[PDB]
Amino acid sequence: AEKPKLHYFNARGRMESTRWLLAAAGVEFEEKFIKSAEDLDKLRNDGYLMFQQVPMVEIDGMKLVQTRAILNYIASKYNLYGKDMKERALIDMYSEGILDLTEMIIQLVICPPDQREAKTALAKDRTKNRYLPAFEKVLKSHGQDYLVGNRLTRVDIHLLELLLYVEEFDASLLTSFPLLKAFKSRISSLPNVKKFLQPGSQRKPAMDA
C-alpha cells in the first residue's frame, strides 16, 4: 500500500518497538535516519515534530509523534490491538509493564556508573521477581498460545522483544520461566517475526555511544 516512514536515529532507542510491530504485521517501512543535528532541526523548523521530538512516523498522511500514539495507531490499523475494549485493557496493561522493564534495562547503559551496579541489581531483581513471573503466570493462568484472546496481538511482539533484551542483558534470568521460553520460540518462528530476526533486516543492535 503505502510505506510508513520512521524518523529516528540509527539506533534501537524509542523506535525499535515500532519497527518490530510494523515488521510483525508484514508492513514494509523505510527510515530516514538522523545523524546530523541539522536533520533534527530541519524536521523541527519544517513543522514535523508536534513537540520537537523524535520518534516520528509518517503514515496514512499523519506526522505521528510520541511512541505510544505510534504504537496504538499501527496496532489498530493492522488488527494487533485485540478484539474488544476489554482485551485492549489486558493488552495495554501488559504492554505498559513490558515498557516499564524495557525502560529500566535500556537506561542502565545511560545512568551514572555511580549507580550502574545497584540499578543493575534492581533490573535483574524486577526482571526475575516482578515482570517475568507476571507474564509466566498469564501464560499459565490460561495455558494458551498467546497473551490475550488466544490470538496474536501487539503485546506478544512486545513481550518477545523484551525476552530478547533480557537474554542480552542476562540470559540466565529466563531459565526459571518455561512457558515464556516456549512462548519465545513459538513467537520467534512466526513468519514475519522470523523474517525480522533474520540477518540483514531493519532490526537494530544494542548501541554503544
Residue matched to cell numbers 493492522 = 78
Residues 1-30 binding ligand GSH (CB under 6 A) are 13-14
Q: How far is CA 101 from CA 34, 60, 145, 183, 205, in A?
A: 26, 31, 22, 18, 18
CB nearest ligand GSH: which residue?
53
Give which of ligand GSH, its own copies, none residue 54 binds (C-beta under 5 to 8 Å, depending on kind). ligand GSH
List the one residue from 1, 51, 114, 198 that touches its own copies (CB under 8 A). 51
Residues 122-141 binding its own copies (CB under 8 A) are 130-131, 134
| Closer Cβ to its own copies, 68 or 142, answer by number | 68
The 3-state secondary structure of 55-77, one letter per residue: CEEEECCEEEECHHHHHHHHHHH
Give which of ligand GSH, its own copies, none residue 62 binds (C-beta under 5 to 8 Å, depending on kind). its own copies
Give which of its own copies, ligand GSH, none residue 17 binds (C-beta under 5 to 8 Å, depending on kind). none
Question: Any binding-site annotation on 202?
Answer: no
List the one residue from 67, 102, 127, 153 that touches ligand GSH (CB under 6 A). 67
| Closer Cβ to its own copies, 2 or 117, answer by number | 2
Give which of its own copies, ligand GSH, none residue 103 binds (C-beta under 5 to 8 Å, depending on kind). none
Cβ neighbors of 18 (< 8 A, separation 6 or more) are 6, 55, 57, 67, 70, 71, 74
Q: How far is CA 62 from CA 65, 77, 175, 205, in A?
A: 9, 13, 43, 28
Give the residue among 16, 46, 41 at the shortest CA–CA distance from 31: 16
Q: How far apart are CA 174 and CA 154, in angstroms?
A: 21
Q: Total number of residues binding its own copies (CB under 8 A)?
A: 28
Cβ neighbors of 164 (< 8 A, separation 6 or more) are none
Note the residues at the interface with ligand GSH (CB under 6 A).
13-14, 52-55, 65-67, 96, 100
